[PDB]
Amino acid sequence: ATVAPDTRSLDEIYQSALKEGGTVTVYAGGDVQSQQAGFKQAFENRFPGIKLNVIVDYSKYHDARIDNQLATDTLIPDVVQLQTVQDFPRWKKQGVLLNYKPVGWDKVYPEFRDADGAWIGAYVIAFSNLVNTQLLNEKSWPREANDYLRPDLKGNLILAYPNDDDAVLFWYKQIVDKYGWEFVEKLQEQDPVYVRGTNVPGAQITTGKYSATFTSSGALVPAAGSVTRFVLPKTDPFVSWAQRAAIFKQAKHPESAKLYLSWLLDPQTQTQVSRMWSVRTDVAPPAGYKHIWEYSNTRPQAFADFMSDRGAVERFRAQMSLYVGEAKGDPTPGWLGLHPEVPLA
Ligand SMILES: [Mg+2]
């Protein structure tokens, strides 16, 4: 089906959405439900009477959950938004996605959108250095990969399990490409602490238990008095991608789903709610930064290309497992089962 970019205002979409019962359900990729709390609060304040029933789980479990619900005709969500970006062209070809070009679709950087409107990049996430600014002075913030091998960072590092999250894994793929397996070998001698949940390193660094990590997201504009800082490398690669979102063809609440996606793309949402880069060409990067596509030391399309070859990803993941061990501990989102209809208690 051929569609044109939505020309309606948010309020015009919103009045139309209100007829649907006052709830839109979103299966969103993430480590913990709290990561979506800001979006939920902003959305529900902006559109009174419509609840953003967003449900967080690892992307690698949400996509399987959607595949199984499709197979059994028990589909629950209106919208899916994940970092497993290779799923979206597959679901498109399967015919289960609603072609919709949201408000602002024309301004989305072309590689961050499906040409027919089958899916859209919602916002940009990047994984790189996160440092404790009270433990480390600015001149000593580690920024390059080999900075983490210096003696005064031994025992002071906490890291997300690369074998539990493919975006984390891709950071290592790039670094091994450049510096070889010797980097991973030397890194283990630093006695890093590995954890599940990409939220956890930043959480424990904030409390002062660790000094730094190199596979974390973070605010480009930190809040006043923040003890942490997201810091890019000067030269070394970092990971970035556009989180992908789509509406299902069988969505029970298509107008509300449309509202959500159009709201995500709004310039205010892109700069005031989303905490990193925007997918839009007409949205200024935060002061001090360039557009994500202007950094020579990251390539969002490289993550997508990586994720398309499951065999290559698996082989690299398995080798990393031999260096860091099996991913230990409980899954941070909790265990949602096959048919979560609301967030966990
Ligand atoms: Mg030792």
Author numbering: 28 to 372
Study authors write:
In this study we show that IbpS, a protein secreted by D. dadantii, can bind Fe3+ and Cu2+. We demonstrate that exogenously added IbpS reduces the toxicity of H2O2, probably by preventing the Fenton reaction. Our work establishes that members of the Ibp family exhibit the same fold as SBP proteins albeit with significant modifications making of IbpS structure a prototype for this family. The reduced pathogenicities of D. dadantii ibpS and Botrytis cinerea ibp mutants reveal the importance of this conserved protein in the infectious process deployed by necrotrophic microbes probably because of their impaired capacity to detoxify ROS produced during infection.
The crystal structure of the translocated region of D. dadantii IbpS (residues 28–372) was solved at a resolution of 1.7 Å using the single anomalous dispersion method. The asymmetric unit of the crystal contains four chains A, B, C, and D that are nearly identical (rmsd < 0.4 Å). The structure of the IbpS monomer displays a typical SBP fold with two α/β lobes connected by a central hinge region consisting of an extended two-strand β-sheet. The protein displays an additional α-helix at its N terminus and an extended C-terminal tail (residues 352–372) that, to our knowledge, are not observed in the other members of the class II/cluster D family. The C-terminal tail connects the two lobes on the edge of the substrate-binding pocket and appears to stabilize the protein in a conformation similar to a closed state, even in the absence of ligand. Furthermore, the central α-helix in the substrate-binding pocket, which is involved in iron or ligand binding in several class II/cluster D members such as AfuA39 or FutA40 is absent in D. dadantii IbpS structure and replaced by an extended loop. Moreover the ligand-binding pocket is partly occluded by the C-terminal tail and the N-terminal part of α2. We observed two dimers in the crystal formed by A and D’ (symmetry-related of chain D) and B and C’ (symmetry-related of chain C) that were original and not found in other SBP structures to our knowledge. The interface buries 1230 Å2 and is made of electrostatic interactions between α3 from chain A and α15 from chain D’ and vice versa and between the two α15 helices. Several residues involved in the dimerization, including R223 and R337 are strongly conserved, suggesting that dimerization might be a general feature of the Ibp protein family.
